[PDB]
Amino acid sequence: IIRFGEVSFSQLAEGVWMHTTYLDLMGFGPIPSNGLLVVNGDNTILVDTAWTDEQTEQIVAWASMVLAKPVRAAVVTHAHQDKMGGMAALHGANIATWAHPLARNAITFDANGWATGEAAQSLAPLRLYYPGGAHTRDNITVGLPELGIAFGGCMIKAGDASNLGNLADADTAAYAQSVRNFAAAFPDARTIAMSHSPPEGRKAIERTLDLAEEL
C-alpha cells in the first residue's frame, strides 16, 4: 500500500515486504511482478528484481534510505529473458546476487530440495527450496516458515479455466509433484505469495492439486 516511484511495497509480516512493479502490455493492461524485501538485522535480502533497471534501482534506494536497511544480497527466483535490466542495477551497486543456474553465485540444492553451502548461510532466514524432481527445470521457491510465508510461481486462479487446457496437455504429473513438494516444504505457510499475482491462502495449493488428479 506504500508507493515509492514505480514500485509498490506491501508488508506481509514484520520484517518482510513484498514489492510489486507493473508492465504495460498493449491490450492486456498492467501486469504485476512480485518480489520480497526481507529484513535481517540492519540489512535486507532482496528476492527478485523488478521488471526494469530503474524500477530495481528504486527498490535499492528504498531499502537504503527509507528503511535504513540496505540490500546486502539478492536471490533470483523467476528471471525474465528480455526484462533483465534489473541485473544491471544490482551489478552496479555491488550487491551479491544468487540464482539457480540449471548472477555470479550459484545456489546448489540437496536431494531433499533445500539450499546448501554459502548460499543457505548468506540468505538466511529465507529457506530456499527447489521443488522439482528428475528431468524438471522449475524455478526455485522461498519461504519464511516461522512467519507462515511461502513464495512460489503462478498458480491457477479461482474460477479461471484459462490455463486449464495448457495444464491438461503438459506433464500434469510432474507439475503436480512440484506443487506437492512445495506444499510439504512449507506445510504451515498460510500466505502464499506469487511471482505474478497477489498472495492467496493454501486454498490455491489445494485447488491446483485437485485439478492435476482430475485431468
Stretch that binds Zn ion, among 75-83, 95-103, 121-129, 155-163 (CB under 5 A): 75-83
Binding partner of residue 15 among Zn ion, a second copy, none, CB cut-off 5 to 8 Å per kind: none
Residue 91 annotated as part of some ligand binding site: no
DSSP 8-state code for residue 78: S
14 labelled ligand-binding: no
Sheet holding 96-99, edge to edge: 2-4, 7-13, 16-25, 29-40, 43-47, 71-75, 96-99, 105-106
Give me the 147-186 binding string for Zn ion, x by CB under 5 A, dash otherwise. Answer: ---------------------xx-----------------
Binding positions for a second copy, 32-91, rule CB under 8 A: 32-33, 78-83
Site for Zn ion contains 195 (CB under 5 A):
yes
Mind spelling out the 3-state secondary structure of 159-215?
CCCCCHHHHHHCCHHHHHHHHHHHHHHCCCCCEEEECCEEEECCHHHHHHHHHHHHC
- When computed from its CA atoms, the radius of gyration of the chain, rounded to whole angstroms, is 17
CB–CB of 144/126 below 8 Å? yes
Cβ-based nearer residue to Zn ion, 35 or 143? 35
Contact 131, 139 (CB under 8 A): no
Tell me the DSSP string of 105-168: EE--B-TTSBB-HHHHHHHTTSEEE----TT--PPPEEEEGGGTEEEE---PPTT--TTHHHHH
Separation between Cα atoms, residue 43 and residue 159, nearest integer Å: 40
Among 7-15, 52-60, 156-164, 187-195, which window interacts with Zn ion (CB under 5 A)? 187-195
Closest CB to a second copy among 91 and 196?
Answer: 196
14 in contact with a second copy (CB under 8 A): no
163 binds, among Zn ion, a second copy, none (CB under 5 to 8 A by kind): a second copy
Quick check: 168 binds a second copy (CB under 8 A)?
yes
Which amino acids are annotated as binding site for Ca(2+), given as ranges? 54, 57, 118, 121, 210, 213
- Catalog residues that contact a second copy under the rule CB under 8 A: 23, 25-29, 31-33, 78-83, 139, 153-154, 157-166, 168-169, 171-173, 194-197, 207, 210-211, 213-215
Which amino acids are annotated as binding site, given as ranges? 54, 57, 78, 80, 82, 118, 121, 135, 154, 169, 196, 210, 213
